[PDB]
Amino acid sequence: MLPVLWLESADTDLDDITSYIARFDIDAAERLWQRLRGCVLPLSEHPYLYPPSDRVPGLREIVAHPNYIILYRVTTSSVEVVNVIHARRQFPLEH
Amino acid sequence: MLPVLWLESADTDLDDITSYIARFDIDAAERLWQRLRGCVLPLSEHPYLYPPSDRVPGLREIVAHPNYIILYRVTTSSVEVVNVIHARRQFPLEH
Amino acid sequence: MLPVLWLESADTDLDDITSYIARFDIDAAERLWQRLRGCVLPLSEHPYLYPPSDRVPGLREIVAHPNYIILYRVTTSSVEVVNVIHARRQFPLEH
Amino acid sequence: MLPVLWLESADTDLDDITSYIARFDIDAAERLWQRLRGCVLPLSEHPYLYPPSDRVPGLREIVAHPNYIILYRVTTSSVEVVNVIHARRQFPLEH
Amino acid sequence: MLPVLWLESADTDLDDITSYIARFDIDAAERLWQRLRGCVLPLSEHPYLYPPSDRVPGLREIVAHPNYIILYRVTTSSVEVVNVIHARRQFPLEHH
Amino acid sequence: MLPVLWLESADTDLDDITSYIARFDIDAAERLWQRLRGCVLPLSEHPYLYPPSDRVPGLREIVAHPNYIILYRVTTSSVEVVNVIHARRQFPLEH
Amino acid sequence: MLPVLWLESADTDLDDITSYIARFDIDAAERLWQRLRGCVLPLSEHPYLYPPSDRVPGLREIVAHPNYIILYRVTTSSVEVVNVIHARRQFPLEH
Amino acid sequence: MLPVLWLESADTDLDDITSYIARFDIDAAERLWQRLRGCVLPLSEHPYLYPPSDRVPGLREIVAHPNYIILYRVTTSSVEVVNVIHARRQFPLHH
Amino acid sequence: KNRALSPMVSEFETIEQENSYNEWLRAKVATSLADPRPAIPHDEVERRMAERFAKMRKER
Amino acid sequence: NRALSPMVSEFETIEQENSYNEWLRAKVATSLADPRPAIPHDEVERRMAERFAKMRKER
Amino acid sequence: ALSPMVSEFETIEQENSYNEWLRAKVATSLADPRPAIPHDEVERRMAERFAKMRKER
Amino acid sequence: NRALSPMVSEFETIEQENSYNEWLRAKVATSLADPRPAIPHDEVERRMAERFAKMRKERSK
Amino acid sequence: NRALSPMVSEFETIEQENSYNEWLRAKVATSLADPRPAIPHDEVERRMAERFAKMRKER
Amino acid sequence: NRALSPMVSEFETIEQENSYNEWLRAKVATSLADPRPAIPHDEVERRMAERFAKMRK
Amino acid sequence: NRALSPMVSEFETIEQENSYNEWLRAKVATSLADPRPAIPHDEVERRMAERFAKMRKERSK
Amino acid sequence: KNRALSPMVSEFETIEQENSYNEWLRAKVATSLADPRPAIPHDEVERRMAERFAKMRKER
Questions:
Q1: Where are the coiled-coil regions (chains A, B, C, D, F, G, H) (predicted)?
Q2: Number of domains into which chain A is organized
Q3: Which of F37, F69, I17, J6 has its CA 20 to 30 Å from the CA of residue B56?
Q4: CATH code, domain carrying F71
């Protein structure tokens, strides 16, 4: 079993995505977090489930939702969630 | 395990999608089939991995690509791919 | 992996419990079904998680909620949910 | 694998609960310790088995018995048992 | 994981052993079953935890107790308990 | 994982057992060391595999061979092999 | 589980190959049968283990030995060994 | 489930093999990497598909292609790919 | 002689309550195991639950 | 209907979303009603291979 | 007003009171400076306490 | 650049796809350069929990 | 034969050890020959549970 | 034509490979066209056991 | 003291079992109290492998 | 001494050649296990492979 960790950049992504969505619909933001959370925890037992990313070598992409992708990687000791991004737009940004 | 089967409707969906994409880029169509193929076969050992569908009770949805969704169901004897659709447009049709 | 099935009696139990709770709070009914659903689906990959039943030899008991217990058995071919009962009262009753 | 560790507050909870039960029935006390111990040790291989706590964010709850709940957390290095509490009464209390 | 199953011979051994120990001490019989059961159920997630037997090819030996050995084997679909025997004496074999 | 360590007294036991055996059958002394070595190595990844000791609370007993027992304990930082003893005789004695 | 069946042509291949080898080294013939047999028996629990064939669509290839390939396919109801062939020479050849 | 890891030697093997092939055909080399990768990741859920090698005790051989063999071993904590060699000639001879 | 049970030692209030319950439970299970209808896949239970809730919500 | 943010939904209006989901439900309902048997996955692979092979040969 | 089919608590004020007790109990528990003890030390203490209880009878 | 069918790409042009992919590579490179260690998943849940709670308090005031 | 050391063997002599091992293979042969299907672990649990109940009751 | 390197291909030329693959697709098509039932793996084992026994006589 | 059946106990009598278990806790209590540090498993492997090397070279004169 | 081997019987042409190859392999394995460097995760190999192909294609 590999434990699931998040990089702080991925938690920032998460903070920014749920914040922006909740300015329109807070229940949708909460629904999205529940999807993301549910995509990620089975990686603990099946870390190689998702395809290796062709745009970022060394990571894998979950298409969690038609608008959101989770980028993650499998280390010696853990599954690391690296970023959560919008699938079509360059969002979340800056910081 | 459970063996993986396609309903004939799903194979038609798959023909309609790849053939349409292949008007513009046949490599894109072949990449997409390779993606769908690789989402579906691990269902044979982890059929409950993807979330229940909120739109079609009794099925589950794989977001295989930001534009395509696979709908499948877990029966007593098999995993059945039911349909492959576009995630945002009403495409393809049904004959 | 063993597939998860419910005995018809267990689903009647489910129907009896959720309909009674919904007389008071549909939301609470859905929440409990969401909990029961979540206790049984990892049995597909870890059939012997919960302890052998003291009262019904051959079954195992999940205490899904301080008021509800799931009874299940691991057969040669499947995990079957056998009943869902109130933990302190004799409910759902007979039919 | 994560090692399983008890916070010291959690061990005095255990001391309080079994002490109290034992004034009425030692076997019942010892049967409960056997349940709690058997619920917790598989957390070293299935730390995310039990649902997040709604009441105590960051913790997870085991309903070990219709009357007892184990609260635990999954850290970077270990699984920690945080408290053991009666599920419906505010017991054991604060010494 | 692999599911855990017992051949009927293994369940018979288990019957012979516990009922015999129970002639003398029924708690000792019950404690031994609890040991044997707890040696076997981990095989579901770690079937190869024990090394192949030198004296019975195809099988693996668990020394559950200084007096009792579990023989099991890993198949395509399951972990199968094949026999439960005394480690030192030719026990049990019923005389039918 | 937890590193596996031997208490100095365990290595003395292991020394006393192998030298006594080998003044009969040195290849048997080696076969036994190979058994004990193989019993102990997986403890780094499955430290709770073997049952608690009934005669020494806080330790666990491996019945490595019908005549030999390994006593170990799992620690905040390590698995520690504590003693290796004959299972029916009081051997090795201290010195 | 899907049963493993052989098409009569596959058994003829296997007859032709083992008999040829047996004219030089019957123990090598037996070792080869033992190897092919070993590649094929887990197909009943992992039918999709080996990759889709590029040159024969609908089949899958096992490189059982540097000189021998097994062709098989997964049907609705079974796994069928279709042919056993030499990896480099056109052998066995028709009757 | 065990994580899949490569020894530095095996990645050097990979580097030289695909380098040499790419002198003649980059696409052939890329397809061979895709085959090798697909032979190795299913080792994560079934470390023991392949039988013990009889010429390299401790290792298991996958014949991934009629010209290439993967040597791997199963440890207490991981599947380790040890080397990737040519099946027939002594090839290949820092990362 | 019934005994009362402390709520920290039992989820039942008296041993009669507990014994009665376990006999009811054992009987409930025996009946379920004797039903000859086939077991249903989990995801059809999903379908049935989804529609039951839908039905319940179409009222007020 | 009113527009939804591209961060909140993959549809541009509630009306478009509802339309899609009733379309999807209809599609699935016919799929399941089809009397023909399900085909094994490797048969789908065989058909895909040939479908591509055709497309390519027609340049 | 909670049916015992609905909640292990009888009202929402008694639920919230339990949840606040719990939250404070956890806060206290997590703040303690003392190191966590390995599971098998807990087993050792548990064994000692039962042994002591059974003796004193 | 060249416009793309909404059924071939999730991007409208090849220019926008290349810009996105370079942006994403840059984002990942920043992420993996951050010195701070990773946090357990359940700490992410704890933070998510408290942020939603915060948003709901603010929304009710 | 001649007596083995209790620190070397669980058997008193070599002949005794070879007899046991031939007995053991005989047992394993019979078990694999039995045509009956293997039972799930949890049915062994229930047979044990009932065998202990009847033992205890008859006392 | 074209010669091929023994670390690129298990074949020596591009026709030998093409020839093999055509022969293979042919062999398979014949195999699938044979109208006899498949036999269970166990029968193949028994057949093989007998064929080896004959060979050792 | 009263005999035990060899299917029931690995000890011949109860006195012999108690004698053993008291010896065993005494042996343990000593091991835990020893001030010397624990050694990695690898060092035990090396020590052992060297202890056999010496043995067989010894049985060669 | 030497024996030729049928191409149906062996992937080597000669038993001297088979034995030479097998000693080479045992040697090769032995040095691999002796390297003190840590093992790398699969995904890092995937990263290394991607960058090497990308380099190769550019360099052309």
A1: none
A2: 1
A3: J6
A4: 3.30.2310.20
